[PDB]
Amino acid sequence: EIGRTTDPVRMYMREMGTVELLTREGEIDIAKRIEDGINQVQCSVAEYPEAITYLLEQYDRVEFVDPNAEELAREKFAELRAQYVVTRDTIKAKGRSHATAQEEILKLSEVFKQFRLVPKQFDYLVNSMRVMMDRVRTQERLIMKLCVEQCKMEVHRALQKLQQIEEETGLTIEQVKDINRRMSIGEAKARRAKKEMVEANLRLVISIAKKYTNRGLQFLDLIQEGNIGLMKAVDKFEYRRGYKFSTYATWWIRQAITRSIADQARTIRIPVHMIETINKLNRISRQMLQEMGREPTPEELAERMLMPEDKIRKVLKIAKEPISMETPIGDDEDSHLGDFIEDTTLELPLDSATTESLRAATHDVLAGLTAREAKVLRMRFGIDMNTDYTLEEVGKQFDVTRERIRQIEAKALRKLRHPSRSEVLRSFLDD
């Protein structure tokens, strides 16, 4: 049925129309499932002990306040450290994965979950698992390939590397694989859960956006930026608070849309704070105009904004936006503003010829002067040579005396001030 509606807006609305809204029950349902996935991944992370070691060591290295447990940090972590250390010994006690050691690990995770962790450390912990997982998988894909293709159940030669991998890792591969795949499953559940709310609330994004569409960036840019905001809001929402989802989401959507419309949408990028001030200026001007019945003078406007006159004037001049080079200035649409603008960088052929003549004349006048005087003047002002050498360099080159160079220059100036020699240079009088 598609009538080749090339309009991207139509394609977007057609795609988004399929997913149907559901309220007051789903939001709770999906939020519960998200929290369940996160709890699963946290539990399985706590299961892996070397991650706990690494995190505790990293905490010790670096050294943040008010932890949500249903020198404060150090004294609260002292007993957790003692518990973890005494749990290591029990793991060494007669069972690698003994039920008692597992119960101690469970209680350690239960205590640990009661604390709050910065998300970046959580990601660091996940990558600390990913790196070793990839290393072990990479070093062993070749051995699995060979055993599958050649052996079909060398062997002892390949077994050395496998044993070395175990020695380096120092833990059972099977539990590592379990924790890694459990990471994958928990994360997959969480991700696939959040997609549902995101695809549900696109209409909300549409409404909030169209409230701002009046000639800004473009409709679709606003919509996409709002979708970024919606993803953020879905991340931050908690049903435990007991509120409706829309109430929370709308703030993040407005923030994202407005921040983008501030950053983009101008050729010369006014910062955010100035945009806020200009918006205040405009909101005040409308009201004040309808009150007085005319336009407000900048002085009265300054009185109302409680700001100095010069600040207001500066904002008024900053506000304006550039004009297109193709605006038709002629009444007939033949001539455009662009043809009307002049190039400033170029010099004039007249001045080029003048400069060349000046150089020639100066060379002629200098050639008539005493040889050492001429070379001294050239050496001092950088005439004809790439750079000018200072007084000290000239002194150490020709004659160490500093004041002698001063006297040389004085005599050269005296000579060239003699009216006979200067006659032509006077023609360069006005410049």
Partner: protein
């Protein structure tokens, strides 16, 4: 720096990175307080170069010690500023994006490679459906569209072998995987089995694309973008306007949004978003790129802030206001000025008056230079101050500078090459340019507010070619036709007319004078009149056999005025030139004679002196215009009243019902036309020769000295129609569109119109005025197309050595001779001499230029047909030889090697375009006495002894005593004649007679008639009439024929009493007269028909303007084309199918039968098997040039186009030599198509240049091998100009995007041969003065 050619090709991503100096990552332009550029924004100094010369932002690495060294801390290199004009950047797209030009620009190259319909690529790109890249498992294949749910259905089952993708990644993966060689060979094989014409041609074009695409070295992957380049900042500036505002180009905006969408896509992918959101972003990125590359082609154009669409790159190239036409082919210029023009009559033909102020400004630097030379100013600044204060020495220096320095004067529009001419300046005061009166005609200038532009040539070569090629004294003949352009006009003609004319007895009859000097001394003393008839002693000179001037003295009868005029005439001309009352034609002929006898310099001086004398004596005449000078016939009101009363009686007679509407209308119009003619003739009789003078006695009658009549006769300004309007009646008028109003306008401008008559005339006034206003544009467009087609023509060789030509005869349309030979052959080279040993002993030597003398010889020997070498047959490659061209009409000799023919031809044809606008057929009657000679006539004698013709093409002529043709006519089929061949007919006699609204089948013999295969009710209808009871038989056609009587073909058996038909002697044909459908025989079956009687009666019952010539040159196909006979042999009908008329031609000797479908309602001229030859006309209607070329050959189409173009111009009295139209036709037959397997790399159906085929063919035939066979194609102006071997010429002409796309894909190479090419690239053109230069470079190809 120096180069040789320009090549175009696609850009690989690594190439685009190669151009780059860094990549642009943020959309920022500049900082809002300190306007310096931003770090990685669109204007960064690090990647595009430093803003201010030799100064980085920090300035630590300065003083030209570090050259090319990058200052690390600010990242700003220390070099010149100009680099911001040439450094480029790049942007690395997050998702591959299709290039719009190679997707939508039809025929959609991406579609051709993959063989997918466009809408499928569309649906894939916009994420609407999947596509299968690789089905290893047999279920699916490549390029199969998969719907959304269908992909789920196939994945869930099969999986893990199923590659399907969606969006531009999918298309790029498809292109990357496809192997060209395989399809090249497979399609090569596929054409070898079956050729469905449509399928065959589409396969040929796709194979062409693949083969070229392999050759060029491009890879299809590159049609889809991954890296996108960014144009240098200074070509899209952001500049501060004086008011504090900023002005920006639109590319800034488009680039910003591409960067924004790209950055946000990277952000989205980094963030692991749902799929609908990333699909949305991917579409918007693709759309932004499309809007950047070409706005609005994707349907909806992105509008700027204001209301209007942003203008993109393709917009910067394409239009009339793109780069190509507005900044490269023609550009604004220094050293130039402009002002109003005014007449200066004291000037010599090579001078122009230049204001002092304009001259002071134009020649500024020259003045500075010579002020410094003489020591008057020490330095240039002193020279400035000297000039701005205008000291006297400045004026002396200026007078010394301009001397001998020519300037160029131009008046737009420049229609032809005489619109720019070089003059020598004379300084004047005032502010208007003074122009010599004689050059106004060439410029088409009048002094009522016009303006002209002045340009200054600078170098020595420019000055010399202004003096030699362009000076006004070098241009006296027109290049279109040979006639002079310096032609005296209004006041000059009036003065010379008044001075020359003679009068009765007025002062000084019959004195005798010792030469002209006494005549002047008498006239200026008041002792005699300019008009006295006097006897004067005169000495002429006459050029001898070897150029000597013999002097001859005599006593002539002349007037005082003519004697005085004779003092001007250069010696060498006869006295008879001056001895009659000179008009306009006489003066122009006088100048032409002086030119072709004496040379150039005498004519220049003579033209001046004519102008001076004409002005002087026109002023002394004191001719004026009063209102009494428009006399009105004494009997106008009588004519008007008689016509009114007669029309009143015809209208009264109408109400008796004797007269219908059409009768009354036509009668009234005829009456008023007759009255108008009577009034006009009476007015001219009263006006023209109305002066009665006493000749020393009784009365005498002479032509009048009425001033308006003088302006009429002299040809100064008036005409007969204008005077008719002033003194007769204004005439009849036309309603807005076609209809001619019934009552005419009886008043004239002296009497004054009334309200209603004025309102009536306004219609025609406005219609004509709007016509001109809206006709100029069409003229301009036509001439532009013509100039672009034929620009490459230049005279290259001296003699191609060809033996071809065109036979030429005088045009004898209708009764009277439209054009003799001397106008039509003068100045052309005869090839394959025509000799006539016998009556005339005609000797024409080979290869001679036809001078006037040779033409005179031809006239006195009275020859009619001459074969002449012509451009269309020239054998030179990439040009034409001098000999095949002929004279250079403007100069007067064989044309020089290296001159640009094509532009001259196009200009000469297109220039007159502006002035170009927008039934007694019973028998044949000879006008003048002569002898009849028929040609191609099939005659049959009847019992009446009258010659009946059955030949389809019968032509009637009139040979005179000396053996020329004076008339020609087309005898229709079945027309009875009067006299046979050979006898002399008499003037006014009728020679043929036929039925106009009927084509009769005429009988040859007598006997009994049998009505065969024609039954009543099935084939004919019973027709019953009244008491007389005369019946008629009418044959019904198969359209209404019943199903039972379908196989019955009507025919008339001609039997005798025994039934046996006597056979025609020697010929074995059976007498089976199968007359086709609707053979209406009124006489019933069994009626004796005499020989020569009618058997059946089947009845047989033009733009002409600027569009007509535009259609002739564009080779458009007439809607109802006449059909031509392809192959000689036997003709018949065949089995009808759905009514498809079936025409079968089986050749008499050839075996292959040729079938033609024929439209149902079209009639057929021929009945059955005849002897029809190649291109024998069989239907009636306009003829198509394509068919002419295919069947008759190239000379036929040239002759056709020449004749039917020249009709349009002759009807307006516009003279153009045929040579130019021949040139255009040559350029219009450029291509050929190959039907053979030769020995070279060609194919079925390829179109290649005729010259290329000639080269390959002669190369192989030098080695024995047989070349391919070709047939020339005829293409319109626009097609032929768009199909050249050079993408720069075509791209500058028209349709830029399409030709650039084709060239880019095919990897073309431009070799810079034409004139437009070298003009664009800023070089010397290969014509005229520059020619020699290129030929040197040509021999440099020998040493490389």
């Amino acid at each position: 720096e120096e180069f040789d050619a320009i090549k175009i090709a696609l850009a690989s991503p690594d190439m685009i990175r190669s151009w780059s100096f860094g990549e642009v990552k943020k959309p920022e332009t500049i900082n809002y307080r300190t306007f310096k550029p931003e770090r990685d924004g669109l204007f960064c100094a690090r990647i595009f170069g430093p803003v201010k010369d030799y100064e980085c932002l920090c300035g630590k690495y300065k003083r030209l010690k570090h050259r090319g060294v990058i200052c690390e801390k600010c990242g700003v290199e220390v070099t010149q500023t100009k680099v911001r004009r040439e450094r480029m950047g790049h942007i690395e797209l997050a998702s591959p994006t299709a290039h719009i030009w190679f997707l939508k620009s039809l025929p959609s190259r991406i579609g051709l490679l993959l063989d997918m319909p466009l809408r499928d690529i569309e649906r894939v790109l916009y994420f609407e459906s999947y596509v299968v890249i690789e089905g290893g498992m047999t279920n699916l294949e490549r390029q199969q569209i998969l719907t959304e749910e269908q992909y789920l259905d196939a994945l869930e089952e099969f999986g893990d072998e199923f590659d399907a993708k969606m969006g531009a990644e999918a298309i790029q993966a498809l292109l990357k995987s496809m192997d060209l060689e395989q399809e090249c060979e497979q399609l090569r094989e596929e054409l070898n089995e079956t050729n469905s014409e449509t399928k065959r041609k589409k396969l040929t074009k796709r194979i062409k694309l693949l083969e070229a695409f392999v050759q060029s070295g491009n890879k299809p992957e590159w049609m889809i973008l991954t890296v996108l380049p960014v144009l240098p900042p200074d070509l899209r500036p952001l500049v501060p306007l004086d008011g504090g505002r900023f002005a920006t180009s639109d590319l800034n905006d488009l680039y910003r949004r591409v960067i924004n969408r790209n950055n946000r896509l990277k952000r989205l992918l980094d963030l692991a978003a749902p799929d609908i959101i990333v699909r949305n972003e991917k579409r918007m990125l693709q759309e932004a790129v499309d809007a950047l590359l070409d706005n609005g082609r994707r349907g909806r154009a992105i509008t700027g802030s204001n209301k209007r669409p942003l203008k993109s790159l393709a917009d910067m190239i394409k239009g009339k206001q793109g780069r190509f036409r507005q900044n490269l082919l023609g550009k604004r210029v220094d050293y130039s000025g402009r002002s109003v023009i005014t007449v200066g009559p004291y000037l010599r033909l090579h001078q122009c008056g230049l204001p002092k102020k304009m001259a002071l400004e134009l020649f500024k630097p020259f003045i500075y230079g010579k002020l410094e030379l003489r020591g008057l100013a020490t330095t240039i600044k002193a020279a400035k101050k000297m000039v701005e204060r205008e000291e006297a020495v400045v004026w002396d220096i200026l007078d010394e500078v301009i001397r001998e320095h020519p300037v160029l004067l131009n008046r737009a529009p420049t229609l032809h090459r005489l619109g720019i001419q070089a003059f020598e300046p004379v300084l004047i005061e005032g502010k208007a340019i003074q122009l010599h009166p004689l050059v106004c005609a060439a410029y088409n200038a009048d002094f009522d507010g016009d303006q002209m532009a002045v340009h200054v040539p600078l170098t020595l070569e420019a000055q010399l070619e202004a003096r030699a090629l362009m000076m006004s004294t070098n241009n006296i003949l027109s290049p279109a036709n040979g006639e002079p352009i310096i032609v005296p006009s209004q006041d000059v003609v009036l003065g010379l007319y008044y001075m020359t004319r003679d009068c009765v007895n007025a002062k000084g009859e019959g004195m005798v004078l010792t030469g002209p000097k006494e005549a002047e001394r008498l006239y200026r003393s008041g002792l005699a009149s300019l008009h006295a008839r006097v006897k004067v002693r005169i000495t002429e000179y006459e050029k001898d056999a070897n150029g000597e001037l013999v002097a001859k003295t005599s006593l002539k009868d002349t007037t005082v005025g003519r004697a005085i005029l004779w003092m001007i005439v250069p010696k060498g001309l006869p006295y008879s030139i001056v001895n009659q009352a000179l008009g306009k034609k006489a003066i122009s002929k006088m100048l032409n004679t002086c030119y072709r006898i004496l040379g150039l310099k005498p004519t220049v001086i003579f033209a001046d002196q004519i102008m001076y004398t004409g002005f002087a004596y026109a002023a002394r005449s004191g001719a004026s215009v009063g209102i009494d000078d428009m006399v009105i016939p004494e009997k106008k009101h009588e004519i008007i009243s008689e016509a009114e009363a007669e029309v009143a009686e015809i209208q009264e007679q109408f109400q008796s019902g004797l007269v219908t509407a059409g009768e009354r209308y036509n009668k009234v119009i005829d009456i008023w036309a007759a009255a108008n003619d009577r009034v006009s003739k009476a007015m001219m009789d009263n006006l023209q020769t109305e002066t009665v003078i006493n000749r020393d006695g009784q009365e005498e009658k002479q032509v009048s000295f009425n001033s308006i009549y003088m302006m009429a006769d002299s040809g100064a300004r008036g005409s007969a129609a204008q005077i008719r309007q002033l003194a007769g009646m204004r005439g009849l008028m036309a309603k807005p569109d076609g209809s001619i109003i019934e009552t005419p306008i009886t008043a004239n401008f002296r009497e004054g119109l009334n309200v209603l008559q004025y309102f009536i005339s306004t219609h025609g006034a406005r219609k004509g005025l709007a016509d001109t206003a809206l006709k100029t544009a069409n003229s301009g467009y036509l001439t532009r197309r013509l100039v672009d087609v034929a620009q490459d023509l230049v005279v290259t060789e001296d003699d191609c050595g060809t033996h071809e030509g065109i036979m030429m005869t005088p045009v004898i349309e209708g009764g009277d001779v439209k054009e003799p030979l001397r106008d039509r052959v003068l100045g052309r080279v005869t090839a394959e001499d025509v000799l006539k040993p016998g009556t005339a002993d005609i000797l024409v030597p080979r290869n001679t230029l036809l001078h006037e003398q040779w033409c005179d010889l031809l006239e006195e020997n009275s020859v009619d047909a001459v074969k002449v070498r012509s451009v269309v047959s020239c054998d030179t490659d990439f040009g034409v030889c001098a000999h095949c061209y002929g004279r250079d009409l403007a100069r007067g000799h064989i044309i020089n090697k290296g001159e640009a023919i094509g532009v001259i031809a196009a200009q000469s044809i297109g220039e007159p375009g502006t002035q170009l606008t927008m039934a007694a057929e019973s028998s044949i009657q000879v006008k003048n006495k002569g002898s009849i000679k028929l040609s191609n006539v099939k005659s049959v004698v009847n019992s009446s002894g009258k010659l009946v013709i059955t030949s389809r093409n019968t032509e009637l002529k009139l040979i005179d005593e000396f053996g020329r043709t004076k008339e020609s006519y087309k005898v229709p089929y079945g027309a009875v004649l009067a006299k046979g061949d050979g006898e002399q007919v008499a003037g006014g006699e009728t020679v043929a007679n036929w039925d106009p609204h009927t084509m009769p089948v005429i009988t040859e013999v007598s006997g009994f008639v049998r009505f065969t295969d024609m039954i009543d009710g099935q084939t004919i209808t019973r027709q019953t009439d009244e008491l007389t009871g005369l019946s008629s038989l009418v044959v019904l056609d198969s359209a209404e024929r019943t199903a039972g009587g379908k196989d019955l073909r009507p025919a008339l058996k001609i039997v005798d009493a025994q039934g046996n038909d006597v056979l025609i002697p020697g010929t074995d044909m059976p007498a089976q007269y199968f007359l086709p459908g609707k053979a209406i025989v009124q006489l019933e079956d069994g009626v004796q028909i005499s020989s020569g009687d009618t058997l059946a009666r089947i009845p047989q019952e033009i733009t002409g303007g600027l569009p007509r010539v535009a259609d002739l040159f564009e080779a458009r196909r007439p809607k109802e084309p006449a059909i031509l006979a392809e192959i000689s042999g036997i003709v018949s009908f065949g089995k009808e199918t759905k009514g498809k008329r079936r025409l079968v031609i089986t050749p008499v000797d050839g075996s292959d039968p040729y079938e033609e479908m024929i439209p149902k309602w079209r009639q057929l001229n021929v009945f059955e098997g005849e002897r029809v030859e190649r291109g024998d006309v069989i239907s009636d209607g306009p003829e198509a040039p394509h068919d002419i070329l295919r069947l008759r050959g190239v000379h036929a189409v040239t002759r056709y186009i020449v004749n039917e173009v020249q009709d349009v111009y002759r009807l307006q009295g516009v003279k153009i030599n045929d040579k130019h139209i021949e040139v255009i036709v040559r350029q219009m037959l450029r291509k050929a198509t190959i039907v053979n397997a030769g020995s070279s790399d060609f194919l079925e159906g390829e179109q290649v240049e005729y010259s290329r085929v000639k080269i390959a063919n002669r190369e192989l035939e030098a080695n024995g091998k047989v070349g391919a066979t070709y047939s020339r194609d005829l293409l319109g102006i626009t097609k032929a100009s768009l199909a050249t071997e050079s993408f720069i010429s075509a791209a500058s002409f028209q349709e830029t995007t399409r030709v650039l796309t084709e060239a880019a894909v095919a990897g073309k190479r431009d070799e810079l041969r034409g004139l437009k090419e070298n003009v664009i690239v800023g070089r010397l053109i290969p014509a005229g003065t520059g020619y020699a230069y290129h030929q040197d470079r040509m021999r440099r190809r020998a040493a490389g």
